[PDB]
Design a protein around this nucleic acid. Sequence first.
RNA 1: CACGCGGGUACGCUAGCCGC
RNA 2: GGCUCUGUGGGUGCUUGGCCGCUGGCCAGACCUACUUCAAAGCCACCGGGGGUACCUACCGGUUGGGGAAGCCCUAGCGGC
Lengths: 479, 239, 445, 102, 331, 173, 60
Amino acid sequence: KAELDRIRRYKQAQKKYGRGPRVDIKSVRDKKLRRTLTNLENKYKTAALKAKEAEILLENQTGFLEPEGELERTYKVRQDEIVKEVAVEVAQKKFELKLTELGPYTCEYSRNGRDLILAGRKGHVATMDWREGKLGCELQLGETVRDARFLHNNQFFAVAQKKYVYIYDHNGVEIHCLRKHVEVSHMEFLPYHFLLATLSISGQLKYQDTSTGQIVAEIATKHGTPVSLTQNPYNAILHIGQQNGTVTLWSPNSTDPLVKLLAHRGPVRSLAVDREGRYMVSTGQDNKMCIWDIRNFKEAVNSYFTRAPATSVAISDTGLTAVGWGTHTTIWKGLFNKERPVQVKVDSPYMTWGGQGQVVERVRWCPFEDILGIGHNEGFSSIIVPGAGEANYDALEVNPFETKKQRQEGEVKALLNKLQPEMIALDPNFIGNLDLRSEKQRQAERDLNTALKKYLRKQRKKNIIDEKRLKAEELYRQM
Amino acid sequence: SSLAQQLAQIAANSRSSFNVKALKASHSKSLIWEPRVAVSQTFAEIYSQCYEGFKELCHLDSRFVPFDATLFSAQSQEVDRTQMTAEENAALDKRVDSFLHLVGSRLRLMPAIKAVEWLIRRFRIHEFNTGTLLATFLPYHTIPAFVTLLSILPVQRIPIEYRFLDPYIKSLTPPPRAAIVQQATNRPDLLSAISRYTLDSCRAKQEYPGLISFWGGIMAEAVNGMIDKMRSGRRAIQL
Amino acid sequence: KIKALTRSITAQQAPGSDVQRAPRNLAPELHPFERAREYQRALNAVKLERMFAKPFLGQLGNGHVQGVYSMCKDKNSLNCIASGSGDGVVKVWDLTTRDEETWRVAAHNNIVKGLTFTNDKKLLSCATDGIKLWDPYASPSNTTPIATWQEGGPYTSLSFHRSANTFAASSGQGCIRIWDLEHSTAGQAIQWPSFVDTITDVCFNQVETSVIGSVATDRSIILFDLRTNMPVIKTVLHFACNRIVFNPMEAMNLAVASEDHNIYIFDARNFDKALNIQKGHVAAVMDVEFSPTGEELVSGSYDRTIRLWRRDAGHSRDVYHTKRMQRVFRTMWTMDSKYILTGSDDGNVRLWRANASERSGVKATRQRQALEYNNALLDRYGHLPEIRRIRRHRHLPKVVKKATEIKREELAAIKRREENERKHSNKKYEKRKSEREKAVLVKQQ
Amino acid sequence: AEKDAEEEELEKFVLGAKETFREQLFRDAPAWEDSDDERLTISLAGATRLRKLRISESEDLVSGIEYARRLRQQYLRLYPQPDWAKPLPLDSFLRDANSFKV
Amino acid sequence: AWVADKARFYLERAAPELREWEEKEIFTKDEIRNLVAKRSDFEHLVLAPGTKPTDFLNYVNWERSLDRLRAKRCARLNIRSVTSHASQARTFGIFERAVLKHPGSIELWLAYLEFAAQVKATKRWRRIMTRALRLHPMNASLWTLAGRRAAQNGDMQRARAHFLRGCRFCTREPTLWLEYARCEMDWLARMEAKKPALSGAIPIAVFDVARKQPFWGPAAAEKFFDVFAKFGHLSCHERIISHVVTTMQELFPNHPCTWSVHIRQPLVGVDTPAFPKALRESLARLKAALQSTTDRKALATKMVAWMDGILAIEKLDAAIRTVLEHTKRSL
Amino acid sequence: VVNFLLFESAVGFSLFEVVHQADTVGLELPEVKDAMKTLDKFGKMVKLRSFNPWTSAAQGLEAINLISEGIMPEYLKSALEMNLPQTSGKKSKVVLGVADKKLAGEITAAFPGVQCEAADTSEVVAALLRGIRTHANKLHKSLQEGDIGRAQLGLGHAYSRAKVKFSVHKNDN
Amino acid sequence: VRKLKYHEQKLLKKHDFINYKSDNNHRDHDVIRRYMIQKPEDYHKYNRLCGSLRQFAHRL
RNA sequence: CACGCGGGUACGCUAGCCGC
RNA sequence: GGCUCUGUGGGUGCUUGGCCGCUGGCCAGACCUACUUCAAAGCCACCGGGGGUACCUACCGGUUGGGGAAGCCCUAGCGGC
């Protein structure tokens, strides 16, 4: 039938843009509610259908590489061959900054890929427009530096120093020093909230608002100094990873950890999560890494092994992932395919960036091009990898070519639509569900031989006589 | 400031625009139109005017038909240079160099300046082929067309041998032949560049008496000055 | 086969074009926190509209000496209104220039109980003296009336036909009487057969011609017909009703403003149970008026309030109040269905706006998109706690808040009395009568 | 062809012509011989350096002639054949080194 | 400038036809990317602040050419399901906001009328013509287009009404009045071919009011006589021509134009023995005009233009050829 | 409620068709005044429908003379007959908006099916023509031959000199 | 961030990127810039010493 | 109800018969 | 010939290699995703002074409903304390 592709389109749109199964129209009883729900389900079907139809208007294409012959394989490609075959607009982007005298470097892109910041551990913080090559600010900072990270814009960046943390403006003028956050070793900026979440050495996590300036919630992870930290951006929750071997999922609404997935027998060394929120990859001090389907909280496949304790890991906008271990990094392609219900181990890595004697401090992805930054002890090395990068951004959410007026309107709009910190859970689309206990109590207000033995044992330690206990004792006499 | 130095190296070797102000300025740099309209001038009308000029050029001389096929075509309306690979860029450099050697003879005419205005405003010859473009405009080094080309040239794309035009870009006056021959008798690089350019043109059989007289005069005064430098009296040093 | 993603800045600006391109991908992977950002934009919408609720627009000139006891608009025109005060002066205002009145006259000796515009240009005033017909718009100003009636008893209200030149006056002798202008003199009196008490208000049905609704002080409404000049139906409620008004969009729905502090929407074909019961007031309601778009209601009360209502809500969409307003006596929309008019008892004709946070005039398209987006967003998320409390929270004056807390205590007490009477009486083996059923005491023909 | 000339013109007008633009862009015998080379045999799959010069996923054993061909291909891949591998009196004087004598 | 938003609406309207062309094997995905990119650039240029009717016309030409190429590819691949409906709808949308953004450009109005008359929207064509006449009343070409296409349809009353409003408006140049007389006598000709109108008095009436209209001149009457003298195969044509020449005699007694129409008066239905007798008659009238008291230079320039027409006609006698050459040479 | 409104200008007169009319009750409000002021919120109210230039400066002089005297001219009657829908007010009328009350009366006595509204008497058509006269240089510019300043200059000189009879007895220069 | 409009400011009353309430009106920064102290750690060292001195004065 | 390409009755045209 | 500036290399501390998944290999690299029996011991972990504590948080002591590890018993069990 020629309507086969019609049913295929409708099924695919209902899968992708459905965001929910469907309203069951047949089971409603009131006539007006039946009519308005038929109307609503029709409007939503038309909405998802026209959204899938409008997904054709995307301009760019996702990068890729495939092996031609049977013998040559994908990880045996060299940067020279790539930069000879690829366009010059990214052959410019592939570069290497050499910095040797100021400790190992950690790099961190802003969330629009425009500006980056690199922190050499012994005090050297630099922020630059690496695409254009101009640097915004550079400073020697004196003492050591734990971790640098951009804020919402490329305007303010927060540096995690030896004792306090300091947030700075675009010229590197020091705006102010947060001293409530002592000995900060890991930082993550929840960007749809405005939250700076800092894990100290002491195991005390602190959530500070950046818009208002009051710390929202202090939590004390009672067990162990934290070894790793990242942000699940579909939930904005904090996957931190302790030392006894477990990764714990936290959020600022509870002193107890929300969940605790168990992991490698050593301390977990690095974590990363999908921006879809689907899967988390974690690598331990024991030589394995493993993934997890987060929405069901189980392991997906068997453990992969990396031939050293992995120093860092970070996964791209699309399904690629980069684990930087020892002195050279590797990139895997198909860890967690979204469509498959049962995942599969991949034979070989997608491609590797080789080792010439540089210990890798931290890998990151430039969030919107097909490149990837390594920060190693010899400096910064931005290499290119084709398959990565979300090909089609969204100029309402994040714009890699943002004008001044557009950045100002974006800052004030996100400030108006900041999310209150109480709206954080394991399912971020919940606001509107039934408070079941409240509803049953409201309906109550509108409408108005083994267990009794342990019940009497519980009530014989009060020792209230309790006419319900009296009736229960008479019943137990009757039995 | 080692980081700043390496970054400035990257910023000078960079080729594409990456923020809107740099795009607007690099599109505003023009020959014929003033920058005030060159900002707001889109590619259709540019191709219309300069294709009219190139049509007049084809009715002048015969051998402009391959460039009618490949450089002034309705697809070259749209094609962007910085999105093609290195070998496509190299083949494009060869075609541009052939057209420049061909148009070097009739550069004093408004048709040829319209054609070069197309090449600059679309393929960015003044940023990617500064060596051959600057050598081709070199023999006409008195005319206001050369003054404007000196204006629109970006300072860091000028190669080393032609890096003596910095005071003239600072004060937009056409450099005199004394300056050219003096830089010729000091640096062998400029002299070898001019001679390489003219020998390339004469192999391609697109030479003309203006270029030949220029090259002969510059190398003659250059050899005079270079021998006047080389004379040193000590037998070993003069040998 | 190597190929990476190549993004020039032409995707942000075409060269030579100032237009700011913005490619969009609708992937839910790329736009997170959907429901949460929607709730937050809804909360911002509520806070914005409770900031910008500034409903009071103006006051029609210097007002009257005594209180404004009757008023009526020109259903043919758009900016012609007249108000009859208590000392017996009537004034005709044009709404474009609210500085000084267009035409005033000391009409009667007692209060001006009824008033209306004709269909040509003239107007009618009703007092206990009788009724009179003036022509306010003439190239000479004529203060003398051009027709006068006294016979028929103490007239109480007026209502004019939609198309023809007929109008009905509700008298006090238990009858209404119908005049047809330009060929009648004393008019035909229609009445219930054995009927005594005063018929307070009267109103022609506008959408269906020749159906007259009217309320008498026997706590009863009565429907007439005019093609067959005879009364038709009579229902007795539990309390007296101060006004009846028909619906200008549905032909059969009427609203009675009743001294029960309530506003009832009745169906004229089935008077057995009330269609809807709005209960939001503290004192008696002295006026109700359907919207000319037939979906909102104004009710001006005997206390210092004006309540705006939705047609199927049954509770206060909004409330207006002002220290300078001493009581409220006559409220009516304008034919824009956007500005309401309130004749007070302080002698003022105040002009408020409905939709008290929706500015007028032509809106730019992104602005009207933001407004409609906020409104649809609130229509979805209007029941969560924070949004609910800020959308319901309204400053009421001290006397009204105190008396409405006492009213809630009294109504809860009466409900508990009736509840205990049910539980401990023999009425337990019955179904609870609905209150829409309990509104009508009896119906008779 | 099954395509009209006017149809091809409408093609070049409506849709673009990038393919044809790219097209217009991109417009001794061996004297001596050996016998040990024929006699030799080497295991490409065995030796780990020689693993990278085979053709298919079947080539393990190879005689010395085809082995020499594979090494020549691999040398040419690592370093291309330079263009000088493929009289005038003044040029003869320049290329003579008897002239530059101090 | 919310032109990103407005272009988003128009591209989201254009998307499903492209989905149809992708599910069919008519265009492949690379071509569809080229198409959507070109359409995005066109829509941004169209809705940009600084726009031009040439820009609207080039977008119209591109969309119409895409429709034609799609038709060619469909007929080559033997499909029948894909129609031109969406394409004509979006072309009409482009033209509607085109004439909204630039109402005063008769180039764009004429292109829009040409598009309507091409794709067969006659009622739409009359509506477009009415709006364009309301925006440009003084356009003799537009008035002639309306009247002539209405008479081609057969609406003589509507073609009348168009022409009457036109000559009520455009009173400065007589071009529209000539065109109305031309159409009226063409209607008389169509009736004679079908076989009051037996009189045929409407061109005489047009002449009698043209005499008092403020374009009224000798050369104007000359143009009137020219358009009256075309297609003399009629019934009362001699009556009309005689009334014109008598009116010109009564008004301009010695104008060289009046002498020219007295020269060419008896040559109405000549092409054959009837030709040379009227030729000799007009030759006698011509010699009398050349010897009479009249502006001989202007009259002879009119006559040599007329004889340039005559010599442009072929199949004549060599003797009369040589005597016309002599009489033209003696001027 | 307005449908079409005339507007006599120096180069010629044009009639606009109103779409999404302004509110007559809240006419004295800052929001509606700001909307009248700006151009991006007045072009939604007014859409151009018909234009008529003068044929010659003598005809424009005749226009000013007749219009200021109050009598409509014959070609204005012609243009209104072309643009307005033909009707007599037996069941459906057309509301026009003009400035002069005498011109309103004369157009009403010419066409029975057109009820005119005078800018002297109705504030809504007053504010509407006021906005149009304010933004008049942009609404016509798509078909405005030249500019309006020189036409106003010459037309004012022609009208005032015709009223004065000046060149008959000025020779001192 | 641009100068906040009327409604935008009424919604973001408590918002300012520069001065928090935990920055003490930048008294640290005003004093450091006034007296040329190079080490903000040295400022806070002086500060906690002066704080201990004041609490000893309090107990006395 | 009709709307694409061919041959006919017929063109400075497209109204009508059957196919592709 | 002189001043000034700029760049490159060596030195400014005692001479044992470049790389790696290092008892072996590689500098042309090669192989690539396997293997698995049982989560973890506790403590500590720097914010300037005086001051309020409604809210949240930490700690302590409780309270309703479930929950049953472990301990004890024997009429032996769907057990009993």
